[PDB]
Structure of Uridylate-specific endoribonuclease:
Amino acid sequence: AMSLENVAFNVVNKGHFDGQQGEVPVSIINNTVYTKVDGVDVELFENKTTLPVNVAFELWAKRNIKPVPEVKILNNLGVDIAANTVIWDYKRDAPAHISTIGVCSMTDIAKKPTETICAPLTVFFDGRVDGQVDLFRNARNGVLITEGSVKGLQPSVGPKQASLNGVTLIGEAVKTQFNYYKKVDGVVQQLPETYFTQSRNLQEFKPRSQMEIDFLELAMDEFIERYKLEGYAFEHIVYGDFSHSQLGGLHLLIGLAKRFKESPFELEDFIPMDSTVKNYFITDAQTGSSKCVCSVIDLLLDDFVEIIKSQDLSVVSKVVKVTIDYTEISFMLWCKDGHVETFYPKLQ
Amino acid sequence: AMSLENVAFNVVNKGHFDGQQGEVPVSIINNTVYTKVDGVDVELFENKTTLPVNVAFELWAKRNIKPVPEVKILNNLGVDIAANTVIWDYKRDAPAHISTIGVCSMTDIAKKPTETICAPLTVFFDGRVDGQVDLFRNARNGVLITEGSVKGLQPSVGPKQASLNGVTLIGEAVKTQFNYYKKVDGVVQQLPETYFTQSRNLQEFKPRSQMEIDFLELAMDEFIERYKLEGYAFEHIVYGDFSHSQLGGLHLLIGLAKRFKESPFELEDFIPMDSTVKNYFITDAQTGSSKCVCSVIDLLLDDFVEIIKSQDLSVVSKVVKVTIDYTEISFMLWCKDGHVETFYPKLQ
Amino acid sequence: AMSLENVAFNVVNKGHFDGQQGEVPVSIINNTVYTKVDGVDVELFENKTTLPVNVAFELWAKRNIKPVPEVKILNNLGVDIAANTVIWDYKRDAPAHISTIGVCSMTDIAKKPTETICAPLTVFFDGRVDGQVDLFRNARNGVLITEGSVKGLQPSVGPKQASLNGVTLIGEAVKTQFNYYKKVDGVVQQLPETYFTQSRNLQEFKPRSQMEIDFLELAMDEFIERYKLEGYAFEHIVYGDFSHSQLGGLHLLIGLAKRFKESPFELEDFIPMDSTVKNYFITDAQTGSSKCVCSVIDLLLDDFVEIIKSQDLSVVSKVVKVTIDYTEISFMLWCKDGHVETFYPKLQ
Amino acid sequence: AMSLENVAFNVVNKGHFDGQQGEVPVSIINNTVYTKVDGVDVELFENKTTLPVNVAFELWAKRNIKPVPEVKILNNLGVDIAANTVIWDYKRDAPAHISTIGVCSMTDIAKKPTETICAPLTVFFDGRVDGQVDLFRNARNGVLITEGSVKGLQPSVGPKQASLNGVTLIGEAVKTQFNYYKKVDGVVQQLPETYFTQSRNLQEFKPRSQMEIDFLELAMDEFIERYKLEGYAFEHIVYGDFSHSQLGGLHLLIGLAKRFKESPFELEDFIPMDSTVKNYFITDAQTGSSKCVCSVIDLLLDDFVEIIKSQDLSVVSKVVKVTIDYTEISFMLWCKDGHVETFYPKLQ
Amino acid sequence: AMSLENVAFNVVNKGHFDGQQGEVPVSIINNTVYTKVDGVDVELFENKTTLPVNVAFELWAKRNIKPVPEVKILNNLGVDIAANTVIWDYKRDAPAHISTIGVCSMTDIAKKPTETICAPLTVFFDGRVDGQVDLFRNARNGVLITEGSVKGLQPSVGPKQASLNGVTLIGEAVKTQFNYYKKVDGVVQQLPETYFTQSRNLQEFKPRSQMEIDFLELAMDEFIERYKLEGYAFEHIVYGDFSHSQLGGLHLLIGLAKRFKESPFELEDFIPMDSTVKNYFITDAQTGSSKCVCSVIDLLLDDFVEIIKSQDLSVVSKVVKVTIDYTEISFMLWCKDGHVETFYPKLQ
């Protein structure tokens, strides 16, 4: 018994869709869903998607409200659709996937993932939901997350963090660390050895290692000496060079975060989506130093230090490939006389 | 159990809302209601109203599909709302009234006309629906239509024609002639003696008397002589004068209809609504003769002949009041030396 | 080198997309595509689809401008997508299919039908285009049209008529009769023996047999006697009964066409799309006789006479299944004492 | 004292803007202007322009309601703006020019044409309005129309027809024939000798010469012999060839009009605007013969016969330039062995 | 080779338009430009302008990304258009000028500023671009900025600050101080002696003099004594009087900034645009003291102290004119018994 008024009833009385019986008066005007509360119209939903207003409304109401993998992770693993749930993309303010399985009717391609249309698609299964592990076992292509061991299957320990209602966090009262499994053309695939992005914010950055606590407290010169980072161009790559019209380096979030506490700058997020590498149009308010495409990655400093120290510095320019968030991230390594000049990620 | 998808289900399977259980997938995009029929979207409704798309959709689906009084009649009688039905205004392509009684959660002011909010409003009751006559008896203000006698109440025999799904007609297989009753501040009001407009179209004009048959076929001079209409300025009033830049007369629909068969002209209906007197911006293609506001009434010729002959021709200018469609229509009578110069209606 | 301005350049200079190099200034405002022609904006396209304006613009510009099968036929054969072309649905004023193959960067699911995503889809192939027959041979599911024989494949002779730029016609200067082939899960499927709808209009109806010439000119009683149709309820079924409030019969387009010449009526096409059986909300202007759902089929009278005479008249109510336009059309046959009472189609 | 409500007051009570004092309630919703008439909203204006709704509303209300030159003529003469009036483009349903002079606070570039911003623009002056002739004399660039002689200025006798409220006509009760004057960089320019298009419709075509009366009634062979048009390829050029998939010739409106009475066809007007040469996407219903770009001109047959007979038939291909509607129209003349093969206009 | 998809390609890969070859899939829905990134739509641009979505998209992509004069300065100098660049108005989130020169085609009036249409317009030239100084020399009307001396031309030293991607700043890594030149009807005009607004923000205010450091640190009474400002109504004019229902004074940004650190208030910016004088609807949260139109100027305190001390205090009310940002700013000076009562700017 699916309807617009029933979805709105659930939003008003439960906060989201909870399969409760009931209806409220709804009005649709210019990509917005309103409800009449005591003779006046209250806005329930504003559609920022490329889908019809009422359709997007239902998908939003039916979003997964338990901790879920971040969209970048899901994308990197090649997820096309989710089994009987909606992964909401809070960065895009729209559903993460086009179609659904047993969710919305206007977007459903199938009621169950066992339907043949799903066979060529990489279905996301959640081991926390009953029967989902068995469904992954019977699926041609799929990605599965679990909180524990799955008999016969070799896991891949995922990120420490996960997204709970658009809030990325490392769960204390909830489990956010999952086991990852992937199947391609009926065959369980061995997931690669990978680094993970920390998914932190520029304004309220939290150090997650002693090196990071030290980076923030200590000065450039002292930090570089303490962690013996001479000739690795750390000054340029992490802290950034603001002396010229064109901004130099600054490709590590912890560096932006340090600069931001001292002096604010403008970050124009021109491709607003969830991805491993982010590109920003940066303008530094203090100096006037700027850069159109500034690639920024959020790696735990210790991991970045490991990657840069694990490189051959004997060539002028070279593409370096690093497995981050289950995907291959191309870095551009520039050297001179056996020392780093610059090392930055590329968005692809 | 009212919902958007249930309304659409009824439209698709029954042609209108018929209280049948079921749901279809619906999508709302740019003031249009679409339904998915075998993987493609089919347009169910395009909103031309000032109401939200889904609201207007429900009202349209819930429109009265039996012969009903024409909007002009209902307006002239001072109708504000309808009891448990929707009178659809096919001229405006929108509901005839703003609010509803027991029809839609969004536009309802009340579930029943007995609710005190309805008391100051002129509620339309349909005696063909059970309990509606008793409801009119208990209403402070209202208008009632019936096919037969109502005990103790003095009727008013209405027009021969009525609107059936936007088609105005004189019913053969259905009854279109109703008895009219009106109440004001709890008191039954005596409805005036009145003439009725014929509600005909310019393109498919049908004469409804021998005089009308004679007008459309005989020459101007022949007709005037046959029906002894000398000095009544019929040539100017009914037929119209196209010899000057400004169009003369042409205030009777029959006249326009006669001209239209011979030579076409442009009628710009600048206030598109149902009314007793219609104003048009007329441009005659043949001559180039035009008029911004041209008042046109559709009275049976014999009725117009009766009105014009029942006038005192001894004054230069005079306002003449005629009860047409239960309302007072102001006519402007211009005379010279005991003969009519012009006699036109005024859209006031 | 695909772009908005290049598509518009082609529309302005060639009438549709013709792969010609060049660009014109374009402006997009309220679901309309405009072009600047000598300092003023001229409307190129108004979007009536559920797709983005520019996307729908490209699809319209890239529509098939050669005679193609009618959408009803393609739908009945279970067509999901077209190979390297756009079938434009002139009844819905939108593309016949959601996705495309090698047509538009925005709606393409694949560049070629050989891509595995196309495998589960019923792909329409046009044998008039080079390599398309071989592609049908290599496709898992598909429908193929050809003007001639295909080696090893058993044809199905399709309708005499086809759609050329929204004009349905039987080609004289062009070929409109095609050979039809269908494949399901890699296997060539034998298409059923079938009747075909004539795809005619109510207003410009053209008889296509001597029987049809006779129906439109002879009186009801004269025709029934000439073609010995006594006890087949043709009076009711084809001609229609307008004596009651509810309209009786009138299920054959020829019948409607006959009535329409004599007396006009309102046909409300509530599901506006191309289909074998059409449902209309009919209101007869003369009588006031009406029906919410009136199923109308356009079969050549002789074919209808063949179907009705080939039935067993010994049961009260029975579902009769007839293959029309490659699909199974359920008819409802009602009898009494060995004669037909009614025989109408069902839009299911 | 210009305002939205005052403009609407004028539309409702006068048919257009007439500088009358007063106001009505107005509501703007989805590119439409509504007015409240007895508790319900009536649509006054639907915006089909690229200008804001209220702005376009004012311009429409303030449109010139006297016979004016057709937009094609004004365009061909290089008109950029009008002096203290709005020329409404009824083909585009939008104002003919972007900016205004002393008309609307929103689109005005100046209050008077004497303002220096108007100097580089070709300003249209109407000699029927007081002081407009003197203003043309003081303007750097401009076009002037007059009903009579202008002292010292050499006239150009314009078309017999003019547009009165979107109705093109040859005035009987009004003057539609004007004298034309043009100035460029302060200098009066001599307007060329020219032919004029007849501005007729395909459906209601009226012959304007004995030759035209003869064309529409006589057989192709009979006409060619009567007017001695052998070897001029009139059969192909005017009448059109429908024997092949691609439509042959049919470049004269009279020809289309003749064909249309006998057998209807689809004319897709892909660039909907007023112009001397019109291009259509034609599909002939009877044959299936079609053409993407079909150039059609409406010249009086006698004028076309004069042009084609005044040509040298001794070359294979040649561009022929003809002054029609004050502009240079390029015709493509194709010959073989001293006879015409084809002669068509080019929409350039 | 200008196109929508090429502009989007540049935005995605370069951060703005950089004349790079390539195309991405684009979709336009409800005044927003989206791009398909790995099967999902990502928002590239939301149109807040009165221009068509795609047009505004191009102008935004083609905006000047080097430090430029602030819109208020450009406006005050009477700039109508920019030569081969787009000045983006970050306060209005729309282009600073209507038309363009050699930038966008739908907005271009000319390809070069040498075209005669540009002659009556005040063109902005940037001396940092090659050939631009020579173009200013040949222009009838224009404004030129340079980083250094221009032979023969007498400069006007402009503000210390300039706008870099909507960030107003005094450049350290870039030059923000320009030389200004202006030409009117071919004559180089001597620019006036002027004060400059500091273009600072209320929330992160930075003192730019010792007096300003002192204003913020010291208390009202002590500051007024230190800088001998008795009888100049500094308490009222700069710090503001919050004791009555109507807010007193507070017309200097440094005063709002001081109050804001202590106690926050609501500033309603009802005319959101860049201007020398700003008007706000202020409501003080602590007291409830408010003012509809509160004129606020951001002058360096020392400059304001200079202006107020340079006035004759011998009259009750007087209009005082001050050249700020190259324009004449009218101040209202109110006195009583030889001391200031109030002194505030006026927005015009």
User: Anything to note?
Assistant: Chains A and D do not touch (no CB pair under 8 Å).
